[PDB]
């Protein structure tokens, strides 16, 4: 599945892009999804403790929760909220 990754706040300063596309298997482990992201941007390693995800606009912890991702789905990288 070709998925959209969105970098909010700190995460975008580090990556240098607000978003990118990645190809991942439909069935993937939340932390696996993480490793794929770090690989494109090893720097994110430094912010790892401070990030959470959002899949199809619902939150999810960076665990071994099993995800099912369809093409075009959004994955938000959400550092700590200050609204």
């Amino acid at each position: 599945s070709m998925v959209e990754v969105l970098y909010f706040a700190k995460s975008a300063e580090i990556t240098g892009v607000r978003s990118e596309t990645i190809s991942v298997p439909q069935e993937i482990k939340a932390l696996q999804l993480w490793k794929e992201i770090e690989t494109r941007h090893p720097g994110l390693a430094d912010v790892r403790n401070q990030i959470i995800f959002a899949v199809r606009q619902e939150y999810v912890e960076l665990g071994d929760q099993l995800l099912v991702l369809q093409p075009g789905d959004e994955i938000a990288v959400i550092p700590p909220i200050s609204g």
Partner: protein
Amino acid sequence: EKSKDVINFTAEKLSVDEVSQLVISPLCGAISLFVGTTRNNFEGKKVISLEYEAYLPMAENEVRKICSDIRQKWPVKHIAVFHRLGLVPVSEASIIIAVSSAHRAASLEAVSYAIDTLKAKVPIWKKEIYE
């Protein structure tokens, strides 16, 4: 008569009067409002503005959750949540929340719950812009 959940994100100047107006009900004797505004100082430095970025339409949806949970806890009628996006200068409003109810205790407690839970669960970030 129909209970309203009015949620809006906008880059326009927010109006307290316009938002209070949206929660008025003949059945309600109470309206509580919270208004957040840009302070002119942070950690001892002087501040000219605040920049707000959000993840929509997730933010709007995390605000719906907060409404729903509010209506389960407290007999409220109307709820308005307006957040400004972009640059919010000193003394201008970044957020306005308004809740109406029959009696005051519900509106006061709902508003307080809204702002706390909004600051914790809703995907919004701010950068301070200095002098």
